[PDB]
Design a protein around this ligand. Structure first.
Ligand code: CUZ
Ligand code: CUZ
Ligand code: CUA
Ligand code: CUA
Ligand SMILES: [Ca+2]
Ligand SMILES: [Ca+2]
Ligand SMILES: [Cl-]
Ligand SMILES: [Cl-]
Ligand SMILES: [Cl-]
Ligand SMILES: [K+]
Ligand SMILES: [K+]
Ligand code: NA
Ligand code: NA
Lengths: 586, 586
C-alpha cells in the first residue's frame, strides 16, 4: 500500500523539481518546461525562424543551419538527452526534423541549438533515439519514406530494387554521419539497448506501398534489430559502399533471396507497429501494436543467439505479447517493473506488469493489467520521468493527447494539444494537470533539476560564435573593447560593444546598396541583462546576452535615416537605447 | 477567488498576451495562466504556415518579406466603452505595422504598414461611441522626405506623426504631425480626445539630449477638429501616400487647432485612461510621479479658456522610483508599476487630487514587491467602464532566480495578483518568452469563437476566386491544372487521405497546392508538408489553404499530413514526381 500524493503546486518563489524538454511539433522549436508546474520557462529555436533572438537571421545561426537556413520550417517529434552509463549526463539534447530531413543538437549548458545536419540521401527524419551505453556515441535516426537511389527522376517506382530507406547513425560529438544501413520496408520509431551492441526500429511499411490499404495489408510488419558491433566492424574493415556525393559509409541490411544480412534481423510484429521502447531494466524492446491491440516484447538477452543462428525462428525472441486495448502507440516505464502504454482508440493509459505479461505469454493465467486511466483525448506518446535511463524513478508521467476538445476554453477552429501530468508515484495513476500546448509536441523528456547545469553568462571562447571572433580577428578587432566601422568596398562591418543603456556605436553612415554587418558584444557581467538590436523597416532583429557576441547582415537598400533600437528591456533608459544608420543615396 | 483550474475546469478569462520581439499574439487562460493558442502575426509560423501560405502573404502584403516583428500593445475593439470581442489590434515596432486579429477565428486577418513613419509603438483604440479609429504612435523622428539629403532631426521637415487607422477597413484615416516624439497613447470615453506621451521634446539622438528637459509633455488631440479639417479638405499628403496629413506642431508659440501640449515630467511613458473616464494618467518614469490630466478640463483648454496648459493637471502624486504604467480596479484605485523600486503601488485617485490642492492626505494605500523590474500592468477590464477589480497582471522584465536556470537568456515574470480585496495578493509567477510587454484580459463570455470555418470567409476568398478562374469547385474537386510552367493542384482532404495523392510536374515548375478540409467535425485539422522543400501549412475543418513553391529537385518527393488527425495519421501521405530538366525543353 503506497498512495499517489505528490504536490503539484509550485508557488511564487518556489522552484520546479524537473526540467521538461518538449518537442515543438510542427512549429519547429524545443521548449523547456518546469515540472510539476508544467509552465514554459524557455523556447529554444531550432528549425523555426525566431524573431526574438534572431535565430535564422543572425550569421551565427545561419552558419549552424548551413544551406538548410533557406528553410523556415521544421517538424520535430523526438527530443532525447545524451547518456553516460545508461544515465542522463546533461550535455546535449537531440531532436529530429521530419519536414526537411535533419537532426539538430542542443547544448544544454547554453540552451541553444549548436549543431545541425541534413541527413544525406533520405527523406523525412522521424524516429530518433540515443545510444545509452557506454555513452551516447551515436544518435540513431529513422528516415521514414522509401525513395529511389539515385532520386534523379528516372525511376519513381517504390518496388524498384534501388528504392529503399535507411537507418542512420550520427556521431553525437561531431554531428557528422557515422554510417547508414539500408533496410527492407520503412522505419517508424527506434530505441537502443543497455550495452551498445543493439538498436531496434519498428517498421509499418514492410509492404513498400504508398497507399493506405497497401500499407496495412501484412498481418505483421516487423521490428528490425541492428547489430551495431557488426556494422562498426564492417565500417572499420572498409566493406561498405557510398551513395551519391555523400562520403557516408552505407551498409546493406536488407534480406537477399531469404538470406539475412550480418547487420540486421527482422522480427515479425503486428501490425503497422509504432512505438519502439526499451524497458528501463534493459530486458525488452517493446513495440506498440497500433492496429493490433497488443504490445510485442523482444527479449534483448536472446538477440545474440538470434544473430548467431542458434534460434529456429525470428519470432523466438518474442517473449511477451500482451493484449492491452485499442490502438497501442507507445510505452514508458516506472522502474518498478511496470510498463505504461497509451491506447489511442480507447483514449487511455494502461499500466501493466512486464514479467507477468511474459508469464502469460507462456500460458499462465495471471492478470498483468493493473489499471486503465482515461485521458483526454486520443493519446500519442507518453513519458515517465527518467524512463530512458536505469534510474527511472517512477514519479511523474506525461501523456500527450492529440484532441483537447472541451478541456480548455475554445480558441477558434485550431485546438491545443492536451499534455496531461499523471502522478505514478503510488499504486494508482492519478491525473493532476491538463497542460495545453501549441502545434502538437509529440514526445517530451524529463530530467531531474540536478541533471542540468546551465551557464549564467556566456564564455568568450564559446564555439557558438567562434566564427564571428575569427572574422573580427581578420579585421584586427578586439570584440571586448572595440567600437569601429570597417569599410571594405561596398561592405561595411560595424563592431560595437553594448552596455545598458547605450550601444557602443550610436551612428554610422553607409552608401545606399552597401551590405552591412553589425556585430555586437554585450560586455555586461551581470546575469539577465540581455540586449537586442532591431533595424527599423529592414527585417533585422537579434539578441545579445551577457558576454555574447552576435552578428547580422543586411543590405542598406533605402536611402535616408534609419533608426535601430534595443529590443530587450534592459534598463530604466531602455527606450532611449537607440542609434542611427544614415544611408547616402546612390 | 479561484486560483487553480483543475482538470476539466475552464478558465474564467481569456488573456491576450503580446509576443514581444517574437512577433506573435498568445492566448492564455486566466487565472491558470496557461497558453491556449498562439496567433502568428509578424512571425513566420512553421506549424500553420503563416508567412508561407498564399493567404497569409496576401494579408501581409509586401511586408511578407520580413520574418520578424516587435509587438507590445494588444487591445480589443469596443462599443460604448465595453469590449465587443470583434477584433484585437497590435503594433509592430520593428517594421512599422499595425495588425488586426479576428477574434472569432483567432487569426490575423489584416495588416498595414503605416506610411512615412518609423517604429509603431504605442497603440490603443477609440472607446466611444465604438472603435472607429485605431490610434498608433510612430516613436522616431525622421526627415520628410527621407531621401538621404537631410539627416538632421532639427530640420523643419524632420518629425514623427500620430496615426489613426480605420478599424473596419484597416486603411489609414489620417496622420497628425507633432512636435517631439510619441511613446504610449490612450483615448477618452467620448470620442473627442486622445492623448500621447512624448519623451524626446528635445528632438535629440543621444541619451543626455533626450533627458535634457525637465518636462516633456502629453500631447492631447482634438479628434473632432482633425475630422473636421479632413472633411473640409484642409490637409496635405506626403510622398506617394494619399493619407490626409494635418500639422499639429506649434509654430512660433502658436497652438495648432488639433493639439495641445501639456508639460509633464520627465520622459513620461505610460498614458492610461482611468475606467471612470475622468483622467489621462501619465507615468513620469524619470520623475517619481504620475500626472493626471482632467479630461473634462480639456474642452476649455482647446477653447483658450485656460492660461497655462498645466491647468488641466489636477494631480501629480509622488509614488516611487520609475513609474511606468497605470491600471485601474474600477473602485477609484489606480495601480502603478515602479520599475526601479520593483513594486506595484496602489493609490486612490481622488485622494491624490486633494493632496495636489494642498490637502494633506495619504493617497498611497499599498506597495507590493514584484520580481523584478515591472513594465506594464493590466487589471481585468481596466480599459472599459466594466473594470471589475478582480485580477491584476504585472509583467516584469527580470526574473533572475524566480524560475529554474535555463541559460544566459531568462524568461520574463508575468505575475498574477489578486486585487478583489483591499490588499494586493501575489498568487502566481508566470514565466514567458520574448518579453510580452502588455496583455489584455476579457471575460469568457466576451469572446465567441467559431469551431469550423465558413466557406465564404474573406481569409481565403482570394483563393476561392483563383480557383474559379480554373473552373474549380473547391468543395469537391481533386484536379491538377496545368498552365505553362505553373501547376495548380486542388484537392479535398478527409482523414486519413489526401484527395490528390500523387501528381507529376517538370523540374522548375512553380507548384501551387490548394487543399480544402471538407470535414464537419471540430478539432479535425490536417497539415501538409513537402519534404525538403520548406513547405508547411495547416488546414482546419472547412478551411481552404494554399501554398506555392518551386519543384527545383528531380525525383520523387513525399508530402505528408503534419497534424495528428487519425489512427492512420502516419499513413496520410502523397508523392510529387518531378521529371528532370534534361528530359524537357531548354
Ligand atoms: Cu512522430 S510519432 Cu507517435 Cu513520435 Cu509523434
Ligand atoms: Cu513598448 S512600452 Cu511600457 Cu508598452 Cu513595453
Ligand atoms: Cu539595451 Cu533595452
Ligand atoms: Cu491528416 Cu494526420
Ligand atoms: Ca504494414
Ligand atoms: Ca526628454
Ligand atoms: Cl517510440
Ligand atoms: Cl506500483
Ligand atoms: Cl500605456
Ligand atoms: K491537435
Ligand atoms: K528580460
Ligand atoms: Na552541420
Ligand atoms: Na493591408
Amino acid at each position: 500500500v503506497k498512495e499517489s500524493k505528490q504536490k503539484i503546486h509550485v508557488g511564487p518563489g518556489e522552484l520546479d523539481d524537473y526540467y521538461g524538454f518538449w518537442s515543438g511539433g510542427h512549429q519547429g522549436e524545443v521548449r523547456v518546461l518546469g515540472v510539476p508546474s508544467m509552465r514554459e520557462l524557455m523556447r529554444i529555436p531550432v528549425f523555426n525562424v525566431d524573431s526574438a533572438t534572431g535565430w535564422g537571421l543572425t550569421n551565427e545561426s545561419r552558419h549552424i543551419m548551413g544551406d538548410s537556413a533557406k528553410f523556415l520550417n521544421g517538424d520535430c517529434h523526438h527530443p532525447h538527452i545524451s547518456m553516460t552509463d545508461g544515465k542522463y549526463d546533461g550535455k546535449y539534447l537531440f531532436i529530429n526534423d521530419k519536414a526537411n530531413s535533419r537532426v539538430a543538437r542542443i547544448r544544454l549548458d547554453i540552451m541553444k541549438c549548436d549543431k545541425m545536419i541534413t541527413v544525406p540521401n533520405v527523406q523525412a527524419i522521424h524516429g530518433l533515439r540515443l545510444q545509452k551505453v557506454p555513452h551516447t556515441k551515436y544518435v540513431f535516426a529513422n528516415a521514414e519514406f522509401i525513395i529511389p537511389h539515385p532520386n534523379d527522376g528516372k525511376v519513381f517506382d517504390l518496388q524498384d530494387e534501388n528504392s529503399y530507406t535507411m537507418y542512420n547513425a550520427i556521431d553525437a560529438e561531431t554531428m557528422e554521419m557515422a554510417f547508414q544501413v539500408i533496410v527492407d520496408g520503412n522505419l517508424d520509431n527506434t530505441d537502443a539497448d543497455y550495452t551498445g551492441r543493439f538498436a531496434a526500429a519498428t517498421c509499418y511499411n514492410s509492404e513498400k506501398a504508398f497507399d493506405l490499404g497497401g500499407m496495412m495489408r501484412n498481418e505483421r510488419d516487423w521490428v528490425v534489430v541492428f547489430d551495431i558491433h557488426a556494422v562498426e566492424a564492417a565500417v572499420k574493415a572498409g566493406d561498405f559502399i557510398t551513395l551519391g556525393d555523400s562520403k557516408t559509409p552505407v551498409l546493406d541490411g536488407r534480406k537477399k533471396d531469404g538470406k539475412d544480412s550480418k547487420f540486421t534481423r527482422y522480427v515479425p510484429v503486428p501490425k503497422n507497429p509504432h512505438g519502439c521502447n526499451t524497458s528501463s531494466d534493459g530486458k525488452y524492446f517493446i513495440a506498440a501494436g497500433k492496429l493490433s491491440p497488443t504490445c510485442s516484447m523482444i527479449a534483448i538477452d536472446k538477440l545474440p543467439d538470434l544473430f548467431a543462428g542458434k534460434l529456429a525462428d525470428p519470432r523466438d525472441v518474442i517473449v511477451g505479447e500482451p493484449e492491452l486495448g485499442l490502438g497501442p502507440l507507445h510505452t514508458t516505464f516506472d522502474g518498478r517493473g511496470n510498463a505504461y502504454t497509451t491506447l489511442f482508440i480507447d483514449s487511455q493509459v494502461v499500466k501493466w506488469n512486464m514479467e507477468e505479461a511474459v508469464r502469460a505469454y507462456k500460458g499462465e493465467k495471471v492478470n498483468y493489467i493493473k489499471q486503465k486511466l482515461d485521458v483526454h483525448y486520443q493519446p500519442g506518446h507518453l513519458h515517465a520521468s527518467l524512463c530512458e535511463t536505469n534510474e527511472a524513478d517512477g514519479k511523474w508521467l506525461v501523456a500527450l493527447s492529440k484532441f483537447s476538445k472541451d478541456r480548455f476554453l475554445p480558441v477558434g477552429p485550431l485546438h491545443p494539444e492536451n499534455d496531461q501530468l499523471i502522478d505514478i508515484s503510488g499504486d494508482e495513476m492519478k491525473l493532476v494537470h491538463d497542460g495545453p500546448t501549441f502545434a502538437e509536441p509529440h514526445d517530451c523528456i524529463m530530467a531531474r533539476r540536478d541533471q542540468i547545469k546551465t551557464k549564467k553568462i556566456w564564455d568568450r571562447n564559446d564555439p557558438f560564435f567562434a566564427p564571428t571572433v575569427e572574422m573580427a580577428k581578420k579585421d584586427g578587432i578586439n570584440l571586448d573593447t572595440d567600437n569601429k566601422v570597417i569599410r571594405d568596398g561596398n561592405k561595411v562591418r560595424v563592431y560595437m560593444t553594448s552596455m545598458a543603456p547605450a550601444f557602443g556605436v550610436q551612428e554610422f553612415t553607409v552608401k545606399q546598396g552597401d551590405e552591412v554587418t553589425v556585430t555586437i558584444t554585450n560586455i555586461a557581467q551581470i546575469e539577465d541583462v540581455s540586449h537586442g538590436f532591431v533595424v527599423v523597416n529592414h527585417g533585422v532583429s537579434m539578441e545579445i546576452s551577457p558576454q555574447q557576441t552576435s552578428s547580422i547582415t543586411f543590405v542598406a537598400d533605402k536611402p535616408g535615416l534609419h533608426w535601430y533600437y534595443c529590443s530587450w528591456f534592459c534598463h530604466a533608459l531602455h527606450m532611449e537605447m537607440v542609434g542611427r544608420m544614415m544611408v547616402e543615396p546612390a
